[PDB]
Design goal:
Radius of gyration of chain A: 18 Å
CATH superfamily of chain A: Potassium Channel Kv1.1, Chain A
Number of helices of chain B: 20
Helix content of chain A: 55-70%
Family (chain A): Belongs to the SKP1 family.
CATH class of chain A: Alpha Beta
Organism (chain A): Arabidopsis thaliana (Mouse-ear cress)
Distance between the termini of chain B: 52 Å
Distance between the termini of chain A: 48 Å
Largest interface: A-B, 40 and 45 residues
Subunit structure (chain A): Part of a SCF E3 ubiquitin ligase complex composed of SKP1, CUL1, RBX1 (RBX1A or RBX1B) and F-box proteins.
Helix content of chain B: 25-40%
Number of strands of chain A: 0
Pathway (chain A): Protein modification; protein ubiquitination
Radius of gyration of chain B: 25 Å
Structural class of chain A: mainly alpha
Keywords (chain A): Auxin signaling pathway, Chromosome partition, Cytoplasm, Cytoskeleton, Developmental protein, Ethylene signaling pathway, Host-virus interaction, Nucleus, Ubl conjugation pathway
Structural class of chain B: alpha/beta
Oligomer: heterodimer
């Protein structure tokens, strides 16, 4: 492939960290809509890591933007279940967060 | 957790995209790490509650927003009260503490909005942000304290804030005299200024020519100016051709210029506008929204197209002969994405056809009070501009009635995103996100769903502004058809206890709207007060999270929370001149 210049980690090079499954999709992105993000969760976070490592700003923006929409409109419990997050708070330090949030207009 | 396995910078990057305030708040509650991610990436905050209380002051060191750029303090409780004022030596000690705490929570503020009752508010806050503060918005609907020297209200800002570039006095009542003296006596601050909104809470007879002159002269670096001007030629100090040419030569960097006259021929001639546009090559955004007329304006529009190639946003009030098809005038401005035309009495169907061919890039189109335009004009335009036209405003055009106007806009029904119409009664709106409706008093909403607008699958916000039988209701319940309708502006401030019958007329059936989330309500005027039937009806809105009444209620505000299961944001905001206490 040519398309390579969209990766800053190549324009500075004038890849043992990314698997072929992700590299092929990194490559297929750089043929230059959002149906490309119809990907599963595991490979989405692998695509974020690859986009950062390969320093493709455009890809990273889109992939992280997708994760933002994934958080959007979900209750704390639902965010935890979507991303397999353990609830790290004491009842005291959670009501601290809940109290802090009340100082900002929605 | 695959999200928490990521390097922290990337979790932050994810959170930087989440703009919904409630969603951010929920994300922060998810885990201690996303709390860190949310706090560190929040760009803006509108402060809710009273920062004077110990409840704010003794919050955690964790309540911190290192990347916060815009802080809004204008909505703090109680609404519109003096914040950090001095009007003995004990109070300055506590003011210093509150200010320092705000600096602790929000160390990086570059854009500030504040309710400024008197200069001391600004004198207290600004030292903490003076190195970083670039935009300051002032809010005051209360009368300017009569005992202040001229320009005292802006004095603290122009002395301290060396980074200041943008000043937003659009909703800040003071006198024009105040703005002049301040901006003409602080040259080191004023010569840096690039943005200036001088709306002055829309309670001014306009800036005079001998006021506009010295402000422009003191600000060589202006790029945006928004200002009410006295355009009325009955007064000799009005803004004419001379004031315009001086504005252009004083501010040769102006890219955005929006002048309007607070509501015969104006002291502004075509030849003076040609000279004016000749001196402003980088003009992108031009508004001249006048009550008095500028006659045979086409040659000046051609000069605009010739001399200001960057021109994209055009709004003209009382300009006559803007386009007549014998391409003419405004139709030669090919770069236009936005065209708005108020009170063009000789604008015809032939004009719209000519605008259709000439202005290929048009996405926003508006006509107000152009009484020669028919459904045919609109039909042709909506058809010609199909690949681009997404926003339409049709207001008070005599030959254009709601039913036939909605049929005229059918060429783009599946594409139109924003609509603004006034209702006059003589298939899916696929993309329509936003709607604005204007009514006469005692006029029914109900026939709107028959005249068109049957199904609006993506309509999330509606705005209703009003400029009579015993049992008849306005019929808000007929908006229960619209599935995702969440926000509503119900403005009855200019609609007219005695008022209880009008409030009931308009508000009846608001409970039907299952998905109503945010409500901005403006009660009818003579100290604007909600009646009990209105309170009783808004109580029934179980879906409400946000409720902002503009005026007052003697009925306990706590009743609303105990009624509405999920009401969080509630405030009485007397954001009109002049505000009470």
């Amino acid at each position: 492939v040519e398309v390579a210049l969209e990766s800053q980690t190549i324009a500075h090079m004038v890849l043992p960290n990314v698997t072929s499954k992700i590299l092929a999709k990194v490559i297929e992105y750089c043929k230059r809509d959002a149906d490309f993000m119809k990907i599963d969760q595991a490979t989405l976070f692998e695509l974020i890591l690859a986009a950062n490592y390969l320093n493709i700003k455009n890809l990273l923006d889109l992939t992280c933007q997708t994760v933002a929409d994934m958080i959007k409109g979900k209750t704390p419990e639902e965010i935890r279940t979507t991303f397999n997050i353990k609830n790290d708070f004491t009842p005291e330090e959670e009501e601290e967060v809940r109290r802090e949030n009340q100082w900002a207009f929605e | 957790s695959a999200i928490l396995d990521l390097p922290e910078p990337l979790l932050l990057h994810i959170l930087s995209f989440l703009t919904d305030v409630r969603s951010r708040h929920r994300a922060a509650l998810a885990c201690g790490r996303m709390r860190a991610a949310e706090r560190a990436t929040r760009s803006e905050l509108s402060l809710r509650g009273d920062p004077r209380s110990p409840g704010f002051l003794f919050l955690s060191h964790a309540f911190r927003f290192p990347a916060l750029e815009h802080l809004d303090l204008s909505l703090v409780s109680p609404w519109g009260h003096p914040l950090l004022s001095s009007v003995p030596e004990a109070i300055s000690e506590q003011n210093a503490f509150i200010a320092a705490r705000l600096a602790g929570c929000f160390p990086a503020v570059t854009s500030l909005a504040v309710y400024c009752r008197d200069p001391t508010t600004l004198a207290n806050l600004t030292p903490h942000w003076q190195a970083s503060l670039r935009r300051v918005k002032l809010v005051r609907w209360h009368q300017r304290p009569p005992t202040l020297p001229d320009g005292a209200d802006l004095e603290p800002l122009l002395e301290t804030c060396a980074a200041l570039r943008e000043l937003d006095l659009s909703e800040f009542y003071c006198w024009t005299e105040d703005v002049v003296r301040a901006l003409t006596t602080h040259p080191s601050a004023t010569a840096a200024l690039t943005h200036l909104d001088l709306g002055l809470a829309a309670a001014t007879d306009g800036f005079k020519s001998s006021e506009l002159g010295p402000i422009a002269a003191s600000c060589p670096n202006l790029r945006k100016l928004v200002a009410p001007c006295l355009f009325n030629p009955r007064f000799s100090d009005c803004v004419g051709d001379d004031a315009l040419l001086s504005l252009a030569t004083s501010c040769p960097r102006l890219t955005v210029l929006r002048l309007s006259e607070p509501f015969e021929e104006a002291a502004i001639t075509v030849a003076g506008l040609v000279a004016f546009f000749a001196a402003l090559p980088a003009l992108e955004d031009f508004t001249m929204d006048l009550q008095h007329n500028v006659l045979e304006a086409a040659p000046a529009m051609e000069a605009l197209a010739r001399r200001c190639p960057r021109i994209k946003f055009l709004t003209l009030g009382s300009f006559q002969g803007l386009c007549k098809a014998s391409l003419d005038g405004v139709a030669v401005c090919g770069g236009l994405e936005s065209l708005y035309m108020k009170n063009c009495q000789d604008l015809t169907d032939a004009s719209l056809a000519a605008i259709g061919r000439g202005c290929r890039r048009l996405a926003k189109f508006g006509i107000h009070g152009c009484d020669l335009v028919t459904s045919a004009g609109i039909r042709r335009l909506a058809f010609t501009l199909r690949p681009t036209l997404k926003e339409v405003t049709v207001l008070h055009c005599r030959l254009l009635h709601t039913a036939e106007c909605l049929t005229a806009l059918s060429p783009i029904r599946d594409r139109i995103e924003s609509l603004e119409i006034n209702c006059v009664w003589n298939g899916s709106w696929e993309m329509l996100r936003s709607l604005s409706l204007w009514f006469s008093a005692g006029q029914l909403l109900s026939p709107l769903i028959s005249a068109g607008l049957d199904s609006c699958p993506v309509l999330e916000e509606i705005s209703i502004k009003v400029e009579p039988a015993p049992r008849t209701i306005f019929g808000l319940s007929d908006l229960a058809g619209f599935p995702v309708l969440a926000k509503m502006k119900l403005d009855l401030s200019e609609a007219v206890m005695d008022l209880s019958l009008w409030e009931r007329f308009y508000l009846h059936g608001i409970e039907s709207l299952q998905t109503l989330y945010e409500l901005d309500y403006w009660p009818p005027q003579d100290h604007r007060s909600l009646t009990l039937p209105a309170v009783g009806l808004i109580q029934r809105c179980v879906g409400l999270r946000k409720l902002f009444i503009h005026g007052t209620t003697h009925e306990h505000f706590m009743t609303f929370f105990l009624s509405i299961p999920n009401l969080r944001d509630m405030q009485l905001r007397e954001d009109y001149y002049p505000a009470p206490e």
